[PDB]
A paper describes a structure:
The copper- and zinc-containing [name] ([name]) possesses four cysteine residues. The active and stable [name] is a homodimer stabilised by an intramolecular disulphide bond between cys57 and cys146 and metal sites bridged by histidine residues that are loaded with Cu and Zn. [name] possesses two additional free cysteine residues cys6 and cys111, is mostly distributed in cytoplasm and is responsible for converting toxic reactive superoxide into oxygen and hydrogen peroxide preventing oxidative stress within the cells. Extensive efforts have established that it is not the functional loss of SOD's enzymatic activity that is responsible for the ALS causing properties, but destabilisation of dimer caused by mutations or loss of metals in the metal site that leads to aggregation properties which are the disease causing agents.
In North America, half of [name]-related fALS cases arise from mutation of Ala4 to Val, with one of the most severe forms of fALS with the shortest survival time. One of the binding sites within [name] structure focused as a drug target is cys111, which is a solvent-exposed residue at the dimer interface that is vulnerable to oxidative modification giving rise to aggregation. Here, we have developed next generation ebselen derivatives based on the compounds previously published with improved [name] dimer stabilising effect and drug-like properties. In this work, we established a group of organo-selenium compounds using benzoisoselenazolone warhead of ebselen with potent [name] mutant stabilisation effect. A new higher diffracting form of small molecule-bound [name] [name] crystals has been established allowing us to visualise ligand pose of the compounds targeting cys111 in the pathogenic target enabling lead optimisation through structure-based approaches. We elucidated binding modes of compounds at the dimer interface of [name] mutant by high resolution crystal structures which are beneficial for describing structure-activity relationship.
Residue numbers in the entry:
A (entry chain BBB), B (entry chain AAA): 1 to 153
Write the structure that this text describes.
Amino acid sequence: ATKVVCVLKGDGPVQGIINFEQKESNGPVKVWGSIKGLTEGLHGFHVHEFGDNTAGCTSAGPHFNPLSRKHGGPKDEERHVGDLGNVTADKDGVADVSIEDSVISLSGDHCIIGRTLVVHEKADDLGKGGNEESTKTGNAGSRLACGVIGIAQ
Amino acid sequence: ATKVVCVLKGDGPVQGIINFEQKESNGPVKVWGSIKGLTEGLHGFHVHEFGDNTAGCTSAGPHFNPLSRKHGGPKDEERHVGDLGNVTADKDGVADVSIEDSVISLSGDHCIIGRTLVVHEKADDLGKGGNEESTKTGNAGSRLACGVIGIAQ
Ligand SMILES: *[Se]c1ccc(F)cc1C(=O)Nc1cccc(C(=O)N2CCOCC2)c1
Ligand SMILES: *[Se]c1ccc(F)cc1C(=O)Nc1cccc(C(=O)N2CCOCC2)c1
Ligand SMILES: [Zn+2]
Ligand SMILES: [Zn+2]
């Protein structure tokens, strides 16, 4: 019923297309698409608070956290709304994304429209890194590509 | 106050940064910023219906028209919500944008967050061009640069 999309771009070779669909406002969001140009392995994947790309992906600010929680993985109670975990890039640098998430939404206070989706340099440790930064960012390092989440047809 | 931003990008480079601010939901939106890389003269300036830039600016669809009206200028009662008229580039190719608009909003069904802002090749005739396309697009021609409209700090 509601369809949203994001095109991810940055300063390097990483580009992606992510689709979000939500049949009902009380239902999960399906997240699907592809990110290419990645190094093989896990890459942190988050909704960040601002749909602001003024100075590139850094302008998007911290993880989208309207409920003032610590950083976690998508299957944790203790997570930011924006905590979508990791995508996995294959040996050819392609991450085929396929996520169902119950915490993000396309309406209400958990709505991600007009926020920024970011794919990161390093794996997200999902809050299990053993340092203070693990509880804030998951130690996922720099921002390879991002885009503002917009309303689709 | 609500603050919103859009980064415009296209070939040339045609590039710009547009800020939006609304002090209250029943009040006007202030629009300001800069676009460079334009030909001297008028350029159509519109909010388009989809925040979909997956295939560049074409995926944005037609002008944002939630109230099912004909195309007009920003001062007209008969306009699309997304009809912000023209911006003006000087001989250096720079348009200084400064608009106040009472029809767009940063909340409710006139909200522009998650839609696309587009700067066009040609002047918008504000619905007065006396052909069929005038009361649909204003005859503003191709899409030089666009971006998805996002939430700012
Ligand atoms: Se979605 C979305 C994206 C961007 C943004 F700035 C706002 C929104 C909302 O729709 N925000 C929002 C939060 C909480 C509740 C609503 C909502 O739909 N209503 C207000 C409460 O009464 C029902 C309608 C919207
Ligand atoms: Se803005 C925006 C953009 C995109 C989208 F899908 C929804 C919205 C909304 O904010 N929608 C909305 C619907 C109903 C009511 C409101 C509203 O007036 N308020 C809720 C959010 O905070 C202000 C009050 C917004
Ligand atoms: Zn987080
Ligand atoms: Zn129009």
